[PDB]
Amino acid sequence: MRILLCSVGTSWAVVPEAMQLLGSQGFDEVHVLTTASSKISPGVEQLLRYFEMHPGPRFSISRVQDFEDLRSEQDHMLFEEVLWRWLLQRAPQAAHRYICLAGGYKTISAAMQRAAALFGACEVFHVLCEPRFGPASTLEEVEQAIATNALRFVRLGPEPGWPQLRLLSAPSFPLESTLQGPVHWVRASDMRLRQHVEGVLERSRHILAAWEGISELPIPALAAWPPSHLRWLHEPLDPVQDKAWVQALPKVELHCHLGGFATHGELLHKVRQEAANPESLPPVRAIPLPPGWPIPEEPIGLERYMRLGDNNGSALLKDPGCLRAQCRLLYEALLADHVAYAEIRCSPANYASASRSPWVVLQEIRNHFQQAMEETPEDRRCHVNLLLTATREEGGDRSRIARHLALAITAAEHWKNGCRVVGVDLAGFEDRTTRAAMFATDFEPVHRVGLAVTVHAGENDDVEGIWQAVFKLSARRLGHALHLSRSPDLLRVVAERGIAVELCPYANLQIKGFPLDEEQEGSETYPLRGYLAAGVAVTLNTDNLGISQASLTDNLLLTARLCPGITRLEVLKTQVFAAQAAFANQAERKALWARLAQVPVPTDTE
Amino acid sequence: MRILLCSVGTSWAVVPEAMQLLGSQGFDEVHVLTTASSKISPGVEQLLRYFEMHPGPRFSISRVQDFEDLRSEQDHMLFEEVLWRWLLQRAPQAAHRYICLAGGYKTISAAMQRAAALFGACEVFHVLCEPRFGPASTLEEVEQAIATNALRFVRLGPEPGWPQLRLLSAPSFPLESTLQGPVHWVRASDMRLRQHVEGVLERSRHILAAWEGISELPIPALAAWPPSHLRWLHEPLDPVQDKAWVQALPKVELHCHLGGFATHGELLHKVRQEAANPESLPPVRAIPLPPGWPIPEEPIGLERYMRLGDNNGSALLKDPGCLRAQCRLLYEALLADHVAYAEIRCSPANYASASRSPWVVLQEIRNHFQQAMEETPEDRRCHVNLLLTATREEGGDRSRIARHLALAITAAEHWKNGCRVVGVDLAGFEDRTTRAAMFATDFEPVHRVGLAVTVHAGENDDVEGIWQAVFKLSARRLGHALHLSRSPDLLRVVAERGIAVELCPYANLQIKGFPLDEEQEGSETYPLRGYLAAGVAVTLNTDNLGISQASLTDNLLLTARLCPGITRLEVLKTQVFAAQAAFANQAERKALWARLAQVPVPTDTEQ
Ligand SMILES: [Zn+2]
Ligand SMILES: [Zn+2]
């Protein structure tokens, strides 16, 4: 197959001369684009007459409707778009597409070659004839010109096109044609093809501009962003102007307690009113929040923080209806926060009763979350995985811990799809009596069945606890752990081994307290920026959605006030770190990475 | 500023009409490019007169030498080069470009728009004049056209250009311009600008084509490869045809023993001749290699493999000259194999004498490697780091282990640059009563000082040892972990925790005897492909360059015979895994990544 596409102007003789580029071999078919002007109807009929007395290849003299003369830029734009559709329709394959530049206006030939470059062409050429004819314009003059070898062919060279423009097909952008005899009259209903081409070229420019430095982008899909947007990422995050952008971000939640979600306000009452046994509901205790909540004047400490959530949890979630409401409302909050992957921490043995074993509670929690996931479309679905919290308490009791670890080992094998149990969370009481090595023997069965481990080291400013968690419990993640910089060896080990650090900005500020909205960083600042500079995989989390009274968006924005000059690219980097640190399998991680590629487009850049 | 660029054919009147695109303000500069045809000279004179009157803006008429008539493709390509260089020189800034395509041939106008789209242009426009003049071609007709508003402008739209094409400058691609009055006659010395532009567009097409599957490429620089080369990457590796390509690869070595390098032959002889005390050299023991070496008919086992290296090691490297020769020759072998990063395992206490403490020996080893490194250019330098091997022994002897661990702890903080000690290797004799957990107490200081641990599983078919290495010794890498698949939980843990598996193809074949050139798979194959499919970070190493008689290239090519249908992209993946698993710091890792981005170009991508 060899198809020749040739525009024609007043000089109809260009097409028969362009027919002779390949010599006696000729073209399998030639298709001619034409305008609607009346100055070229004699040329069109002469072309038809020449085609009649040189038959064998397919012929088309398709004329562009509503295009008489170049009045303004709109005529050129319409002609270009109709050219693109006609080129797709008549020469679907660029491997054998021959394009002639002779006919038409100067802009017509320039658009001919521009379309050749955009979509690809086997050869782009121009035909010239020596001016030694007349008393070629007529049939006999053209025949004499070809017989006497009076044709010059300048081949501008083959055009490879563009990778994502060569796959465009005629059905995607159809060209409506009205027959007026042996001549087609073509028109276009819209400018879809031109808009698609311009968007493609803009994206190609963005990718090629961001190509040098793609390894520094946490999300590779960001290379298609405009350079202004990429410069916007490296700017410091603005906590008030980036509310919408952070809100729309697909986020990863790795440290969220189920029992600390609907602890006060309207959510607590919504959970309570769904109880299956309202007469067994405990009275709502008066738990006054510290003034300025969620940003207290003075840090309140771990004891007061945990007491703030006394209205929900073991007291409330022993009711099956309260538990179901808690799970469904937590999933609704996750969907409202655009969380794409979440790991929820629960204590099923804390909610067990005489007739409801901890396995029953865990199965109910998992099924509630699975039903919530299934009721949600794939595009905006939040995948929820379960971590079981092994709480260590002052006193030495270890039977609830044994129940929780055994429950995790059983559930890790039970559910292989959907909501899964993916790890254990060693949490509870901070002291040198309840450090990691004390429970290092308890977690050998957890390591045998390939269950991941995360460890709270929140309150105790004890480097030894973090070291024991990393090396005696084989913890893959560390909860809080705000004093890694105290031991440079420990910080280097955490960064080298890929152990993720779960930071909870609002909860850390409420419990510990950090300098806020400071222009300079030193000796007291939130360690997020230093951890990132040290190569630590840092994740930002909510800890307790209810007690802290802040969502994931609020925590991400509070990182702007906690760390001076933290860039929003660093927010994306924390999201990527959390995606990598998730206790997810290959399918879950693939879905999460597909979700993370859809970074919201910023507004009011520069 | 606003600079106008125009072409002139037989109708010189296009330029005066094009000067009125903006209106009464006009353009600050009006530059004219045309050919050397004799039919243009009257038009050039008319344009010169029209530039003499209205002396407002700056003018320049450029005539293209060596171009008279559009005869063939050579004329068009020469004109294109003159156009590109003239556009770069006259209008350096794309935001100040107003390119008119009214004049010249059809190809000239098409080249006008092509150059505008390539290097960027603030406006591309065409001017049309009504035919109601004449009996505009003369000065009076042109003036009447300007006054009576008979011109139409078709502004094709601004051209952004290409990001790496609009940064080009005139000095890089100058024009040979000669003056014949007020007219410039310009010509191009060669075709350099076209070659640069074609290379840029070809690379851009390659990047955009591979943009979709860029997350599937272990090295991001591979997206600039031609699509045929990337389809070649996914084809199975050919041990015979891909020899040169694998040899040219920048490689990472993570499992290479210093004492098993010059164990026989010319290298052993050279290490012996470099002895400082030749009279104290032990006699060369008669150690016949198994037939078919390096590929024996049957596996020989770990005992025979270790006995193959009896001519070197402790018995020979106690001599300072022999040690220096061994280190320098090992570095030269690493350079000849294009290894970019290496971790050499040594046992300094094995080579210590009465007057030479293990610290002296380790310092000498480190200084020899650092001197070898410093004498190599940075672009070719192989960074060498040292791992100290704590060899486990039956009978409970643990003084040498204590010495090696203490030596590693001291040396880890001693050297912060160049060659440095970065970890410990737990090797030796693996039996049920030598398992990893037996030594968890010994390695607490190593974890305290943040030294990485690799566990050297050897002569065993046990998964409990691997489990204890992972969870009791906190091993970051595992050597010869050829039985991970037998425990699915252990394989999942190894893949999930990012624990690298150090595979030594030739050594594993020689010690355990995996099948070669088998049809597809099954119950005996080298577990490399199975590990890769399970998400395990797999690295391919030499183990002992001397005992195995194989370089890193030889092992990489042997993986093609060991694992049927393994793709060379998986070889690149193993290199990336070794780079990620190295016990390197930020600077070493950055240099290693820079060296890995230079993947050799394939040669046989024609099928
Ligand atoms: Zn917590
Ligand atoms: Zn070895």
mmCIF file of N, CA and C in Angstrom, chain A residues 12-17 19-20 46-55 129 132-134 136-151:
data_model
loop_
_atom_site.group_PDB
_atom_site.id
_atom_site.type_symbol
_atom_site.label_atom_id
_atom_site.label_comp_id
_atom_site.label_asym_id
_atom_site.label_seq_id
_atom_site.Cartn_x
_atom_site.Cartn_y
_atom_site.Cartn_z
ATOM 1 N N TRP A 12 -4.472 22.995 -10.244
ATOM 2 C CA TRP A 12 -4.829 21.586 -10.125
ATOM 3 C C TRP A 12 -3.717 20.662 -10.601
ATOM 4 N N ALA A 13 -2.770 21.173 -11.390
ATOM 5 C CA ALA A 13 -1.742 20.343 -12.004
ATOM 6 C C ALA A 13 -0.762 19.756 -10.998
ATOM 7 N N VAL A 14 -0.787 20.205 -9.743
ATOM 8 C CA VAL A 14 0.163 19.693 -8.761
ATOM 9 C C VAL A 14 -0.117 18.226 -8.448
ATOM 10 N N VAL A 15 -1.389 17.842 -8.390
ATOM 11 C CA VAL A 15 -1.779 16.476 -8.039
ATOM 12 C C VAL A 15 -1.288 15.466 -9.076
ATOM 13 N N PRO A 16 -1.525 15.653 -10.383
ATOM 14 C CA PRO A 16 -0.965 14.691 -11.348
ATOM 15 C C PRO A 16 0.552 14.640 -11.337
ATOM 16 N N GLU A 17 1.218 15.760 -11.053
ATOM 17 C CA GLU A 17 2.673 15.740 -10.951
ATOM 18 C C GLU A 17 3.126 15.067 -9.660
ATOM 19 N N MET A 19 1.568 12.671 -8.404
ATOM 20 C CA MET A 19 1.342 11.271 -8.736
ATOM 21 C C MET A 19 2.596 10.589 -9.266
ATOM 22 N N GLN A 20 3.578 11.357 -9.729
ATOM 23 C CA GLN A 20 4.759 10.821 -10.386
ATOM 24 C C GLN A 20 5.995 10.839 -9.495
ATOM 25 N N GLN A 46 -11.145 19.353 -13.662
ATOM 26 C CA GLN A 46 -9.986 18.902 -14.426
ATOM 27 C C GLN A 46 -9.313 17.711 -13.756
ATOM 28 N N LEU A 47 -9.224 17.729 -12.424
ATOM 29 C CA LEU A 47 -8.672 16.588 -11.703
ATOM 30 C C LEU A 47 -9.529 15.346 -11.906
ATOM 31 N N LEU A 48 -10.854 15.509 -11.880
ATOM 32 C CA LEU A 48 -11.743 14.382 -12.151
ATOM 33 C C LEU A 48 -11.520 13.830 -13.554
ATOM 34 N N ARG A 49 -11.407 14.717 -14.546
ATOM 35 C CA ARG A 49 -11.190 14.277 -15.921
ATOM 36 C C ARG A 49 -9.859 13.550 -16.069
ATOM 37 N N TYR A 50 -8.807 14.053 -15.418
ATOM 38 C CA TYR A 50 -7.522 13.361 -15.450
ATOM 39 C C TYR A 50 -7.618 11.998 -14.778
ATOM 40 N N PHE A 51 -8.359 11.915 -13.669
ATOM 41 C CA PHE A 51 -8.526 10.641 -12.979
ATOM 42 C C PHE A 51 -9.256 9.632 -13.854
ATOM 43 N N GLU A 52 -10.228 10.097 -14.641
ATOM 44 C CA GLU A 52 -10.967 9.190 -15.514
ATOM 45 C C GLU A 52 -10.051 8.544 -16.546
ATOM 46 N N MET A 53 -9.136 9.323 -17.126
ATOM 47 C CA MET A 53 -8.272 8.800 -18.177
ATOM 48 C C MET A 53 -6.920 8.323 -17.649
ATOM 49 N N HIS A 54 -6.723 8.333 -16.329
ATOM 50 C CA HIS A 54 -5.678 7.555 -15.655
ATOM 51 C C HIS A 54 -6.316 6.793 -14.502
ATOM 52 N N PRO A 55 -6.970 5.664 -14.786
ATOM 53 C CA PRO A 55 -7.617 4.901 -13.712
ATOM 54 C C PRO A 55 -6.697 3.865 -13.086
ATOM 55 N N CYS A 129 7.614 22.345 -11.364
ATOM 56 C CA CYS A 129 7.633 22.187 -12.811
ATOM 57 C C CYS A 129 8.306 23.398 -13.438
ATOM 58 N N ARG A 132 7.947 26.181 -18.887
ATOM 59 C CA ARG A 132 8.184 26.096 -20.325
ATOM 60 C C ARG A 132 6.981 25.475 -21.022
ATOM 61 N N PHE A 133 5.785 25.905 -20.627
ATOM 62 C CA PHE A 133 4.550 25.387 -21.195
ATOM 63 C C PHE A 133 3.576 26.534 -21.414
ATOM 64 N N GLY A 134 2.631 26.311 -22.322
ATOM 65 C CA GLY A 134 1.657 27.315 -22.674
ATOM 66 C C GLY A 134 1.938 27.927 -24.031
ATOM 67 N N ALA A 136 2.597 23.715 -16.593
ATOM 68 C CA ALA A 136 1.454 22.937 -17.057
ATOM 69 C C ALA A 136 0.168 23.388 -16.374
ATOM 70 N N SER A 137 -0.869 23.636 -17.173
ATOM 71 C CA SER A 137 -2.157 24.053 -16.633
ATOM 72 C C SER A 137 -3.288 23.189 -17.179
ATOM 73 N N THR A 138 -3.128 22.682 -18.397
ATOM 74 C CA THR A 138 -4.142 21.859 -19.038
ATOM 75 C C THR A 138 -3.712 20.394 -19.053
ATOM 76 N N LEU A 139 -4.630 19.539 -19.510
ATOM 77 C CA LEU A 139 -4.373 18.101 -19.527
ATOM 78 C C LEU A 139 -3.182 17.762 -20.417
ATOM 79 N N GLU A 140 -3.167 18.297 -21.640
ATOM 80 C CA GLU A 140 -2.083 17.983 -22.566
ATOM 81 C C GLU A 140 -0.763 18.582 -22.095
ATOM 82 N N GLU A 141 -0.807 19.756 -21.460
ATOM 83 C CA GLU A 141 0.409 20.329 -20.891
ATOM 84 C C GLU A 141 0.964 19.449 -19.777
ATOM 85 N N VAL A 142 0.089 18.910 -18.926
ATOM 86 C CA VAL A 142 0.533 18.012 -17.860
ATOM 87 C C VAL A 142 1.143 16.746 -18.451
ATOM 88 N N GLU A 143 0.492 16.187 -19.475
ATOM 89 C CA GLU A 143 1.016 14.979 -20.105
ATOM 90 C C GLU A 143 2.369 15.239 -20.757
ATOM 91 N N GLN A 144 2.529 16.394 -21.407
ATOM 92 C CA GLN A 144 3.830 16.747 -21.961
ATOM 93 C C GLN A 144 4.871 16.924 -20.865
ATOM 94 N N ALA A 145 4.486 17.532 -19.741
ATOM 95 C CA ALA A 145 5.423 17.736 -18.642
ATOM 96 C C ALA A 145 5.931 16.408 -18.098
ATOM 97 N N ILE A 146 5.033 15.439 -17.914
ATOM 98 C CA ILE A 146 5.476 14.142 -17.406
ATOM 99 C C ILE A 146 6.261 13.377 -18.470
ATOM 100 N N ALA A 147 5.859 13.486 -19.741
ATOM 101 C CA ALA A 147 6.554 12.756 -20.797
ATOM 102 C C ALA A 147 7.976 13.269 -20.994
ATOM 103 N N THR A 148 8.175 14.581 -20.891
ATOM 104 C CA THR A 148 9.471 15.199 -21.143
ATOM 105 C C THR A 148 10.324 15.333 -19.887
ATOM 106 N N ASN A 149 9.892 14.751 -18.767
ATOM 107 C CA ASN A 149 10.626 14.802 -17.501
ATOM 108 C C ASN A 149 10.855 16.251 -17.064
ATOM 109 N N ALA A 150 9.746 16.960 -16.865
ATOM 110 C CA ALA A 150 9.757 18.360 -16.458
ATOM 111 C C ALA A 150 9.278 18.530 -15.019
ATOM 112 N N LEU A 151 9.616 17.578 -14.152
ATOM 113 C CA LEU A 151 9.152 17.582 -12.771
ATOM 114 C C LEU A 151 10.343 17.519 -11.827
#
